[PDB]
Design a protein around this nucleic acid. Structure first.
Lengths: 77, 89, 92, 96, 91, 107, 78, 94
DNA sequence: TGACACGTGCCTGGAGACTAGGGAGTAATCCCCTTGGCGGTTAAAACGCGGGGGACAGCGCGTACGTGCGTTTAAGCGGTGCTAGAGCTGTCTACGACCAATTGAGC
DNA sequence: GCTCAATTGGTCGTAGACAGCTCTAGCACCGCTTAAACGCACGTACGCGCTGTCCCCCGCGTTTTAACCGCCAAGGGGATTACTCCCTAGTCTCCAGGCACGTGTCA
C-alpha cells in the first residue's frame, strides 16, 4: 500500500518544511523512513494492547508508545 | 515563483496533508504481522497520522539546512541520510 | 468520574483575560500539560529525597526540584511565589 | 466552619487533590504539609504564564477564543517555554 | 555495604574458568547491573497502573523485558526466565 | 527444616532475596508477587553472562588474561544489540573503536 | 585567564582521536567556547546538589547525578 | 621528511588505540575552581569529582568531533571549519 | 612489586512458620461503536508538452596548513605539616500517620 | 440535584534536630627534574572563483478515478457488576552468608 502515499502528499509535506525544489529520487527514501517509523510505533502499541488483553488498540497505547520513544504528544489525553 | 506562496499557504494553514483512506489502509496492513484481526479505534489512526506528518516535517526542516550547507538549492537523498546519521536515528 | 483541572484553568483564564473564552481542545491540551509537569516535579523530588536518605518530602525538596527543572526566569519567579505562599499560609 | 486550605493560601488549584495525588502516587511514604501548597502555587503560576501569551496572540489575530494555533504561536516565541517544552509537539499546532 | 561482587565472580568462574576480573571493572559491572535493574523495575511499575492493578506479577516483568530489550535478547531472556520460574514452581 | 536458598532452588547465582527486598523497599508498587524476583534475577544473570563471554573473548584476542575496561568497551561497541541497549553509557578509560573514514585514505 | 590552559595541542589531539585529518585555525576558539558552556551546565547542577545536602565539599556522586540528569550517564565512579 | 597527511593517520591509529587522558590535569583543575567560584565562594573539591568532570568533557568533545567530521565529508572537503561545528550542533539540538 | 586471592571472627540479613483479610480471578448481562454496504460526484491525481534553470566537470591559482629544530616553563612526583569537616555517636520532642464524624465543592 | 472526599479533632510512635567527638584527606609549601608547549621557518596541498553546457525539474492543460459524503444494518467486545478465595504482608525465631580486617606471592 506504500505506493498509496502519493507524490503530491510528499510534495506538500516538504513544502511545509520549506523545501523549494525536490529531487525525483526522494520519494522511495521517504516511503522507507515512514515505514520504519510506523512499524516501530505499531509494535510498541500492540505490545501494550496485548498486555492489557484488549482487542482494540486505544489512543492511550499510541500516546504511551510515543512517550516511551521520547516524543510527548498532547491533545489525545 | 509559486513554491514560495505554497510554502506560505501550507505553513499558515493547519489541515492534515495526507489523505485519510490510504494512510488508514497502510496502518491496518502493518498491524496484521503483530496480531491478526485487531480493531483500531477511530482516534488511534488520527494520533498516528498526527505523529507521522510532524515527524516528516521536522526531517525535511533538517534536510533543508543539510542541503544549504552544500550550497545547493535542491535537497537530495544523501541530505536525508546525513540528517539521520547526525541525528543518531 | 472524570476529575479534571479544567474548572481551575477556567478561573485562571478569567483572572488574566475576562473577555476570553476557551475551546475544549485547548482545555485538553492544558490539562495534559499540568498532568505532565506535576509528575516531573514529584519524581525529581523523590530522587532528591532518596539520595539524602530522608524519610520525608519537605518544601526544601520541592524547591530544589523546581530550581533544577525549570529554566532561569521561570524558576526565579516560581520560587518567590512558593515562598510567599508558604509564609502567608504559616501566618494563619 | 471549614475554610479550604487553597483559600488559606489564596491559590486556585486544589491543595486537597494535589496532596491526594502525592500520597497515592507512591512517591514517598510521608508527605509534609508545605509540599502541596508549594506545588499548587507553582502550577498556578505556570498556567497563568501560558494563558497570558495565548490570549495576547488571540487578541493580535483580532479573534477572541484562543485556539491551538495560538498556543503554538505562543510557546514557540518564548525563549524559555521553548526550552521547557522543546520536545513536546502540539496537535494542530502547525509551524512558525 | 552492599555489592554484587561475589556473584559476578561466581558467574565469571562458570563462563571463563581461567580469567579474573579487576576491581576497577567490577565497579563497572555493579553499576551496569543497578542500571538495568532500575530500568526494568521502572517500566514494570508503569504497566501496573496503566492497567489499574495494585500488584506486580510475572506478567509485568515479562512485558517490560519485551519492551525494553531488543528482539534477540528478549526472546532468550524471556525463554529462560520462564524456565527458571517453571523450575521454581515445580520444585 | 534445614534452610536452603531460593537461588539454589531456582538454579541461580544472583541473590533472589536481595532483589526481592530491593523491590519491596523501592516504592515501585504496594505488592510484589512471589515470581517477580526469580524472573528478574534470571534476566540479570543472562545479561551478565552475555557481557562476560565477549569480554573474555576480547581478552584472549589481545593475549591478555585480565579483563579491563578496554575489553568491556570492545565487548559493547562490537555488537549491534548491546550498542542499541547501551546507547547513553560513557565508559571511563574505555576509549574508542578504530574506524577511519575511507574517503580520507591515500589515493 | 586559565581557559588558555586548554592548549592548541590538546584540541588537536582530541580532534585526532575523532579521526579529523585537517583542522582550520578558528576551530580552537569555538571548541573552547563550547567546553566552557558544557562545564557551566554540569557544575551548576553539581553545586545545586552539594548545597541541598548542606555539604561544602563537592563530591563525585554529585557529578554522576548531574550527568545522569543531562542524559550522559557515566559508569565507573559509582 | 614525510609528506603531509600521512602522520595524521598514524596519530589517529595511536590515539584511538590508547586510553590515556589527553588534557593536562593541573590546568583543568584550576579552571574548575575559577568557574565554580562564581556559584559559591570557598568551595572545596574532591579529586574524584574533578576526574569525573574530565572524563565527561573529553567524552563530549570526542563525540562532537565524530559528528562534525561528517559535515566536512558531506561538503566534499577534508578540512573541518567552524560552520561545520555550528551546523552539527544545530542539528543535534544543543 | 603491590594488587588480588585465601583466610579468620563475627553478626544481623535471610528463611520456616502461622495468622489475617482484601485484591483480583471469576461468570454474567449489557449496549455502543466499529465494521460492512449502497449511490454518486466531483476534488485531486495522473500523463504529456515545453524549456531554462540549477547542477557540475575542467581549470587556474595562491594562502593557509603542516613538519621540523631549538628554547623554555610550569607541570609532575615526592617529602612534611595540619586542622576543617565528613562521619559516627548519644539524646529527645515536634510532628505527621491513622480514625472518626461532618458537610459542601464538585460532578 | 446530591454524594464522596476534603476538613477538623484527637492519639502517639519515631526519626530527625541538636551537641559532642574524631581521625581522615584536602590544602599548602619546599625542591628537583624535564615533558611538553611555544616560537619561527617554508614548502605545497587544498579550497575557492570562474566558465561552458546540459537534462531534468517546474508550470499548464485535459482526462479520469476513487476519496469522500451520508444514510442504513447489525453484532462483537469494552464496560460494569457481584461473588469468592488464595494469595501476600505482619510477626517471631534462630542461624549461617558474607562482611571488615589480615597476609602473602606472582601477572
Amino acid at each position: 500500500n506504500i505506493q498509496g502515499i502519493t507524490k503530491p502528499a510528499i510534495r506538500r509535506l516538504a513544502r511545509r518544511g520549506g523545501v523549494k525544489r525536490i529531487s525525483g529520487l526522494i520519494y522511495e527514501e521517504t516511503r522507507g523512513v515512514l515505514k520504519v517509523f510506523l512499524e516501530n510505533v505499531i509494535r510498541d502499541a500492540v505490545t501494550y494492547t496485548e498486555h492489557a488483553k484488549r482487542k482494540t488498540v486505544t489512543a492511550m497505547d499510541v500516546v504511551y508508545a510515543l512517550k516511551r520513544q521520547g516524543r510527548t504528544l498532547y491533545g489525545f489525553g | 515563483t509559486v513554491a514560495l506562496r505554497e510554502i506560505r499557504r501550507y505553513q499558515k494553514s493547519t489541515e492534515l496533508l495526507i489523505r485519510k483512506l490510504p494512510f488508514q489502509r497502510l496502518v491496518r496492513e502493518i498491524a496484521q504481522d503483530f496480531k491478526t484481526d485487531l480493531r483500531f479505534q477511530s482516534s488511534a489512526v488520527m494520533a498516528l497520522q498526527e505523529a507521522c506528518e510532524a515527524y516528516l516535517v521536522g526531517l525535511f526542516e533538517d534536510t533543508n539546512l543539510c542541503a544549504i550547507h552544500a550550497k545547493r538549492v535542491t535537497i537530495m537523498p544523501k541530505d536525508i541520510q546525513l540528517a539521520r546519521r547526525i541525528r543518531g536515528e | 468520574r472524570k476529575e479534571s483541572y479544567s474548572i481551575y484553568v477556567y478561573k485562571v483564564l478569567k483572572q488574566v483575560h475576562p473577555d476570553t473564552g476557551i475551546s475544549s481542545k485547548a482545555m485538553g491540551i492544558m490539562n495534559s500539560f499540568v498532568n505532565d509537569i506535576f509528575e516531573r516535579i514529584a519524581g525529581e523530588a523523590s530522587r532528591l529525597a532518596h539520595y539524602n536518605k530522608r524519610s520525608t518530602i519537605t518544601s526544601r525538596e520541592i524547591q530544589t526540584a523546581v530550581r533544577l527543572l525549570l529554566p532561569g526566569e521561570l524558576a526565579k519567579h516560581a520560587v518567590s511565589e512558593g515562598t510567599k505562599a508558604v509564609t502567608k499560609y504559616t501566618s494563619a | 466552619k471549614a475554610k479550604s486550605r487553597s483559600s488559606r493560601a489564596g491559590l486556585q488549584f486544589p491543595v486537597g487533590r494535589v496532596h491526594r495525588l502525592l500520597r497515592k502516587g507512591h512517591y514517598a511514604e510521608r508527605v509534609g504539609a508545605g509540599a502541596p501548597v508549594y506545588l499548587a502555587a507553582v502550577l498556578e503560576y505556570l498556567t497563568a504564564e501560558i494563558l497570558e501569551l495565548a490570549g495576547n496572540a488571540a487578541r493580535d489575530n483580532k479573534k477572541t477564543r484562543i485556539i491551538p494555533r495560538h498556543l503554538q504561536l505562543a510557546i514557540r516565541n518564548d525563549e524559555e517555554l521553548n526550552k521547557l517544552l522543546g520536545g513536546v509537539t502540539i496537535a494542530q499546532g502547525g509551524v512558525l
